[PDB]
């Protein structure tokens, strides 16, 4: 049942158990196993486990991590994924010296937008896009991983879970406690990730929810009714908020060119209706020369 | 924003086919009948009221039960367990705050233990291969509702009410796709409240016309007219409240002038 997999080494502690790297003894296939301990007297098969599986079984795309098998014992539930060299977070860290070349940043963004677009097309919100949840291989592919916080939305959306998205990557419509969020939250995250790729550091590294907003208001100006109708009536907007002027956008990520600036700005747009979709973003001039380089590892 | 609206509609319309039970699985069940199935779904409606679960969670569970009974043969004494496990799985998928397993043990008057409910969850999961993201009548109504001229919540609540009545009666509604039941439901509700018809814009969107919805419509119309006399009554009681604008107390039209 599990006898065919040979555990090689540990690969990154995964909150319902540990995540290993394993080898199929018969085919030679390299895989990543994600253990899920069920116990006795608990609340049965976890809902994150239920969601991650069902939606991942629907998401067959080059830029989304591939679920291969769910080994379904009564004692434990193992999840078998395709294995990839490392996650984006660790890649940037060992590149914190001489940076990541622009063809590769361009390529990583392009593929991510492709994976994201496939998700939103299949009524799925990721809700946890951060570097440690994006995986890279030896050849220059990048992939959406960690669908533990994903859900399947409806048209039009209902009120979903509020506690969603890792702080630094959390959109300002969530922070303001809105009745409804949607696909834009994933696009907000990618924009932060886009910038994070250029500078190698987090764009908005806050240590509380109030600190996060203000950091965004200094970078992008405090939103008002004209830039975002409905903004001052949102449940957690306070009239006390300092009204920061909007800075020159070239100053947000200095190294970006005209096309990159344009695209990021449309991604970090305040009004979620006017934020660029992953769909449209694929037609942006920034991707006119997109190639598929190999990263050095 | 329309942005991904059409894409999702297509994908749902693709997935609703794959997520279908078998038309007459009840034929081959050696101990259970439609009438029993109808007693289970009616009770699950009460279960959703007592816990304030989304109508979608109800719809999902019925789908899980129907797919499970299409491939697994079940005695009557275990039909409530499969019903319960279904509700729990649906709750975990769809709700922000699913109730705990003890609650699902409780509502069955302790007919089954916590282990039975848990062990059953694994069976249901194994049999459905973990494909739980099933399109539903509700997912479709919701979309159809965006085409109202203009928004009228009496029409919405009524269509939801009609759409819920269809879960009860395997015969005939198992023959129709969710998107189809939703077509008839939305039009019949539109007609009862405003006198209006299935709108052009939904013809462009769905491919469906008033002629192709015809067989489903006149099934539903008899169901609607006959509703006051059904063995199962939970839905009529449900849609009597202000939360649903009392739509189950509206006068249905005696003909549909087709």
């Amino acid at each position: 049942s599990m006898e065919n997999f040979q555990k090689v080494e540990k690969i990154g502690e995964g909150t319902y158990g540990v995540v290993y790297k394993a080898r199929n003894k018969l085919t030679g296939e390299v895989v990543a196993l994600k253990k899920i301990r069920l116990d006795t007297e608990t609340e049965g098969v976890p809902s994150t486990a239920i969601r991650e599986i069902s939606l991942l079984k629907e998401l067959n795309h080059p830029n989304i991590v591939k679920l291969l098998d769910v080994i379904h014992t009564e004692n434990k539930l193992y999840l078998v994924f395709e294995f990839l060299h490392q996650d984006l977070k660790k890649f940037m860290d060992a590149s914190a010296l001489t940076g990541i070349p622009l063809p590769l940043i361009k390529s990583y963004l392009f593929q991510l937008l492709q994976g994201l677009a496939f998700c939103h097309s299949h009524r799925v919100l990721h809700r946890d896009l951060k570097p440690q949840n994006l995986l890279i291989n030896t050849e220059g592919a990048i992939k959406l991983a960690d669908f533990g916080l994903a859900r399947a939305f409806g048209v039009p959306v209902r009120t979903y879970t509020h506690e969603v998205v890792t702080l630094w990557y959390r959109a300002p419509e969530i922070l303001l406690g809105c009745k409804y969020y949607s696909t834009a939250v994933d696009i907000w995250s990618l924009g932060c990730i886009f910038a994070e790729m250029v500078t190698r550091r987090a764009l908005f590294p806050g240590d509380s929810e109030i600190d996060q907003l203000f950091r965004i208001f200094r970078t992008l100006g405090t939103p008002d009714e004209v830039v975002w109708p409905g903004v001052t009536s949102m449940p957690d907007y306070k009239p006390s908020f300092p009204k920061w002027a909007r800075q020159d956008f070239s100053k947000v990520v200095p190294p970006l060119d005209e096309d990159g600036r344009s695209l990021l700005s449309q991604m970090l747009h305040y009004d979620p209706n006017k934020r660029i979709s992953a769909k449209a973003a694929l037609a942006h001039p920034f991707f006119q020369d997109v190639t598929k380089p190999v990263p050095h590892l | 924003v329309p942005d991904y609206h059409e894409d999702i509609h297509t994908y749902l319309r693709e997935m609703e086919v794959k997520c279908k039970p078998k038309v007459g699985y009840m034929k081959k069940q050696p101990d259970i009948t439609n009438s029993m199935r109808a007693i289970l779904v009616d009770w699950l409606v009460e279960v959703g009221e007592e816990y304030k679960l989304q109508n979608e969670t109800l719809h999902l569970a019925v789908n899980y039960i129907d797919r499970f009974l299409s491939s697994m043969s079940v005695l009557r004494g275990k039909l409530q367990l499969v019903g319960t496990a279904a509700m729990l799985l649906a709750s975990k998928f769809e709700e922000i705050y699913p109730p705990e397993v003890a609650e699902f043990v409780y509502i069955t008057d302790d007919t089954y233990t916590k282990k039975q409910v848990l062990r059953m969850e694994h069976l249901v999961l194994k049999v459905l291969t973990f494909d739980l993201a099933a399109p539903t009548v509700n997912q479709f109504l919701t979309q159809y509702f965006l085409h109202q001229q203009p928004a009228n919540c009496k029409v919405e609540s009524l269509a939801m009410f009609l759409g819920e009545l269809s879960l009860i009666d395997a015969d005939p509604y198992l023959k129709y796709l969710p998107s189809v039941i939703a077509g008839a439901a939305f039009h019949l509700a539109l007609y009862t409240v405003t006198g209006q018809s299935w709108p052009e814009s939904l013809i462009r969107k769905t491919g469906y016309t008033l002629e192709s919805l015809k067989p489903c419509l006149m099934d539903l119309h008899q169901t609607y007219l006959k509703a006051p006399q059904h063995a199962q009554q939970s839905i009529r009681e449900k849609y009597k409240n202000s939360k649903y604008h009392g739509v189950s107390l509206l006068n249905p039209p005696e003909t549909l002038n087709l």
């Binding site: 909150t15 506690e163 890792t166 630094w168 | 009221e49 069955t108 008057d109």
Partner: peptide, 19 residues
């Protein structure tokens, strides 16, 4: 560097299936 955000009016009844 910061974790992901993680998560009787009606009486109980044994259903009677008569036929």
């Amino acid at each position: 560097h910061h974790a992901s955000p993680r998560k009787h009016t009606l009486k109980g009844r044994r259903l009677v299936f008569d036929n």
